[PDB]
Amino acid sequence: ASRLYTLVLVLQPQRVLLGMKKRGFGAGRWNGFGGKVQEGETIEDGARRELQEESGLTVDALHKVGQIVFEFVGEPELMDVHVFCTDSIQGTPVESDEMRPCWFQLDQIPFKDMWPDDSYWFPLLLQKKKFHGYFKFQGQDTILDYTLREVDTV
Ligand SMILES: CCc1c(C)nc(N)nc1N1CCOCC1
């Protein structure tokens, strides 16, 4: 069994929007916007809802760019993360209780202060290749196993 999650990256020609997670699991790291998909909403609707909750932004269109599965040792549920990106946003990003958003130039992405898996698949995102990933974590800092490939259909 896996649990559905979303991750949204606002990727513009020279910059990318990340949020500093202020509370909860992964507090203290920059990441895309996202979270659990709820009962009664599509995956893409959940992705839009999380983006709006965490940054106030809405979007005209989201594009599927990847799927990442996470195993955490000792946790029974796999995490099935559907990754989206967009270039056209609506609004100005604002800080929420959950996230403090900030734009980063694409050669200044703060990998040392992000989830360790981002170092592996973020390059493919920036290269606009679609990908499937798998990452097995011991705790929040240590990747024990991983796979990563480019795909044709996300
Ligand atoms: C904690 C799972 C996780 C890992 C390991 N890495 C990244 N980059 N994002 C993660 N999430 C994606 C969005 O849902 C919340 C958590």
Token reading at 18:
């990340």
Experiment type: X-ray
Q: Which atom of ligand 1 is nearest to the CA of 135?
A: 5
The resolution, in Å, is 1.8
- The angle formed by the CA atoms of residues 136, 130 and 151, to the nearest 5 degrees, is 80
- Is 70 a pocket residue for ligand 1 (Cβ < 6 Å)? yes
Which residue bears the tokens 């097995």? 136
Tell me whether residue 36 is annotated as binding.
yes
Provide CB contacts within 8 A for 66, sequence distance 6+: 82, 83, 121, 124, 125, 130, 131, 132, 133, 154
- Is 34 a pocket residue for ligand 1 (Cβ < 6 Å)? yes
- Is 54 a pocket residue for ligand 1 (Cβ < 6 Å)? no
- Is 69 a pocket residue for ligand 1 (Cβ < 6 Å)? no
| CA 91 to ligand 1 centroid distance, Å | 25
Domain residue limits at 66: 1-154
Tell me whether residue 142 is annotated as binding.
no
Provide CB contacts within 8 A for 3, sequence distance 6+: 36, 77, 78, 79, 80
Provide CB contacts within 8 A for 107, sequence distance 6+: none
Say how far apart CA 28 and CA 4 lie, in whole Å.
Answer: 23
| 125: three-class secondary structure by DSSP | helix
Number of domains in the chain: 1
Q: Are strands 99-105 and 33-36 parallel, antiparallel or unpaired?
A: unpaired
What are the Cα distances from residue 140, in Å, to 28, 70, 106? 12, 11, 25
